[PDB]
Structure formats: structure tokens, C-alpha cells
Paper text:
The Papain-like protease ([name]) is a domain of a multi-functional, non-structural protein 3 of coronaviruses. [name] cleaves viral polyproteins and posttranslational conjugates with poly-ubiquitin and protective [name], composed of two ubiquitin-like (UBL) domains. PolyUb and [name] have common other structural features: [name] comprises two Ub-like (UBL) domains and mimics a head-to-tail linked di-ubiquitin (Ub2). While [name]-linked Ub2 ([name]-Ub2) and [name] are similar both in sequence and fold, the topologies of how the two domains are linked are distinct.
We additionally determined structures of the free hISG15 and [name]-Ub2 to 2.15 and 1.25 Å resolution, respectively. The bound and free hISG15 conformations are similar with a root-mean-square deviation (rmsd) for Cα atoms of 1.34 Å based on the alignment of the C-terminal (proximal) UBL. In [name], the two UBL domains are connected through a relatively short, likely more rigid peptide linker (DKCDEP in hISG15), and the C-terminal (proximal) UBL binds to S1 site while the N-terminal (distal) UBL binds to S2 site on PLproCoV-2.
Residue numbers in the entry: 3 to 153
Write the structure that this text describes.
Amino acid sequence: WDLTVKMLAGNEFQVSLSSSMSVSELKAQITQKIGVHAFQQRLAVHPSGVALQDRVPLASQGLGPGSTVLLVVDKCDEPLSILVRNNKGRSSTYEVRLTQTVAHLKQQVSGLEGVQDDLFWLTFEGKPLEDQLPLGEYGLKPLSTVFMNLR
């Protein structure tokens, strides 16, 4: 599957989807082309401008081989205030950026809570956060609540 990507603020380039033919794989190929995090990519159908739905298959949104998608990169990486609730249900406020790793947040929580980093993990809406992934890949927002879970 070969697709044209047209960036509003710049270049047009080709990508190939040879695995899942999903939005997730389209975003990953764009990362290889322009070095931008998947969670910062905004995509629409060319030329309608209708936004891509992140869980609907590409085939059902009018897209396949030879289709064109519009791409813009969200320029926003300002700090945002989230909550992390400790083992006793006490929440503390943390300033994070979506380009920081889960490991960055775990360092902040480790210091404020006084719990060595390997004695806990973090969950958002029940899903575990992985140290190496950016906070942005979990859809954290201003006022998101994250849970500290002890071993």
C-alpha cells in the first residue's frame, strides 16, 4: 500500500504500509520520514479535509492504495498540570510535557513520594505506563489523574 502525505506547512512524500494498514502504522512511517512523534501528528483525508478516526480501519474512511492524506504537526509542548494519586489516595500535582517519558514522571513521583522507582508503576484510566514511551502516547491532558501502584 503506497500513500501520498501532504504536510500543510511543508513537504509531500510517499509512505508504504506493508503490515496492519492502520492509522498507527501510517503515523509510525511518518515518524521514520520527518522524525515527529506519532501523538503530535494530525491527519485528514485529501481533499475533503475530514479528520482520520484513530481506531477505524483506513479502508472504511475512503483511503487505500494511491490515496492522499493531509498532515499537520501539533506545535504545542507547553507544560501541563496532572495529578498522581499515591497508595493512600493522596494526589500531588506534577507539571509534565507530553514529549517527556513515563521515566521522567516516575523520577518526579519517586522524589516527592520517597519511594524507589522499581517499587511502583503508574496507570492512566487503568492502562499501565511504559518507562520508555512519551506521556503523549497515552493521551494525558491537563487534569488527567494517574495512579501510583506499589509492588
